[PDB]
Symmetry: C4
Subunit: 201 residues, 4 copies
């Protein structure tokens, strides 16, 4: 009940904000649908809760919640459990809506994403669409090359993703160099399919 009240109290402050700034009706509707999909009638203060625990508890929790994701990603399903845990521990759950530009080509990237559920489209400047779904990840190439996004990525459907900041990406990969190279191999091949090559990889 307390968490349900929290959700309602929050959404109310959100509605009032939108009304104050007079956001268009269709946008208010999108926000409504976003809150519905992202929090599903409940609001928690995770930072506060998880912060009251300790390393092991928090690690056991994240591993439990991400079982499916871990099971659908070739990358983690075979890797060192400590690697996965190190990665899982830094993930931020996010939800994007149909048509959202999650990543735009030519810009500098600050994060990468892991797909738990949903379908996205990888779009290059020269057209050419490639779909990605459950178990796949995207947005890693720029983090590896420290260059620019090599393509755009749109949400085709609602997308439940887990993102990893560029800083946390480097921290874990600095500790597990073999996973970095695994990311490189996949990346080199990906760039090759979109007519690109980068010596950095």
């Amino acid at each position: 009940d307390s968490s349900r009240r929290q959700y309602q109290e929050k959404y109310k402050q959100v509605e009032q904000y939108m009304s104050f700034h007079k956001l268009p009706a269709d946008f208010r509707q999108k926000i409504h649908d976003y809150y519905e999909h992202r929090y599903q009638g409940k609001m928690f203060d995770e930072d506060s809760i998880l912060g009251e625990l300790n390393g092991p508890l928090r690690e056991e929790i994240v591993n439990f919640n991400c079982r499916k994701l871990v099971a659908s990603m070739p990358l983690f399903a075979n890797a060192d459990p400590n690697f996965v845990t190190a990665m899982l521990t830094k993930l931020k759950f996010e939800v994007f809506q149909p048509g959202d530009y999650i990543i735009r080509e030519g810009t500098i990237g600050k994060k990468m994403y892991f797909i738990q559920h949903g379908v996205v489209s990888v779009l290059t400047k020269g057209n050419k669409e490639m779909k990605l779904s459950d178990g796949s990840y995207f947005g890693e190439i720029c983090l590896l090359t420290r260059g620019r996004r090599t393509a755009s990525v749109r949400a085709d459907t609602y997308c439940r993703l887990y993102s990893l900041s560029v800083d946390n990406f480097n921290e874990v990969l600095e500790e597990y160099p073999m996973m970095r190279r695994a990311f490189e191999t996949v990346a080199i091949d990906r760039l090759d399919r979109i007519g690109k090559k980068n010596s950095i990889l």
Copy 2:
């Protein structure tokens, strides 16, 4: 109502603080007028609200709220939308009152400002006033040269501005080098009109 109550509860803590420290009447009046102009009877916890959303939503929101500003600035009205978005996303709304010294000459600057509504006066040490208003920006030269403010800037009227920290200024400009040079061209000419020249530009 909740946001209106928030505004009232806040102002009350503000009044009590001023009374405790015994700020002069005229200052208490200025504070009253400031809160009135800045929050206009409503208080929101933007950090909390926007933080519950995601990249796209937040970007759509800021773009909506800043339509006019974007439309009155030659700088953004022609630029890459992703540039504008990158810039808009880092702006902090602020309000200054008539007679306020927004920038003082000879000091190190930590931010620049974009004028949404209001008129300011650019004042040099050797006297000479130049007015700036809606659509213009100021405080950029020091950020570019990493030197000192080349002039003072006073609020002539109430001023509704959007500020950009020195750190965010460098981050976006590091990504969009052509906008940096555009800022330079305008700056070189501005310095020239106040009898100054800087090789850094």
Copy 3:
């Protein structure tokens, strides 16, 4: 009463979170036992409280609370009081449960621990268990070598520990170089007993 209510209100948000994410029964039971052991029916906002005080008060407080620990550690019981205080001031109280992997071999360490009460087991990859208890500390070697954890450490019983971040470890040791070397001497000998040697030490 207020602190007791806080504890109850917190645990309730914790239970609701676990229910939302559907954590297994046995895990919910572990969480229950954790909160019981860690907070013992009371919840305080230390950051807020201690933050209202000043250096001396806070230092006197931590010294009082850690009398026993200080008295059971050869390391501090003989050291400069200002050293101990510098160390105590940066400690974070934590509680781990039986079977928890506090430290895993081969990973990068971010902290070290001081044992106030409890018994842990130091386990090497080649098997070989060594017990550590009240008065002892562990997890320091990696901080000194900037290498990898040279062994794993499991909680044998409930463990009431005080941890020290890698950053605070370097700050205090940079100020008290002789304590660093004391840590080194013990470390060199410890590595030697697990068939290891590091020139860095």
Copy 4:
């Protein structure tokens, strides 16, 4: 009333904390006296309040509250107003009680202090006490030399001081080099009186 209630609610959480950790009676009494002297029956959330204002307002406020201090310090009373403002803006009000060791010789310093009201004693390792009061400042030498505290400083009476972090000390002094040298001149002479000399100064 709201601020008065805040003070009472806070102190209550403080009393409960001390009771939980069982701090000695005399210490609980010192804490009582500390809260009485430091907050004088009122608790405000300055960070929140001042944060709602802007540069000018906040600067006018701090300048008002620190009029006396500014008027009793040879250092600021003659300096550039923008320098004083830059300094005042970074000060943290603190209160120390009789007998407190504000600074201990031989340790690394992280801040300096300005005396608004109270008397302290500068004590060297070789004995020798020198009193300092209203208008004077101390704890600056270590910040300038990046060395160690060259003496200890005890509160003789209750002391109402304004402290300046080492980071803010460098920021302002990097902008006003002539004030740094003024600090140096005084420092060189101070060290000379306690039988010390440092080429860094």
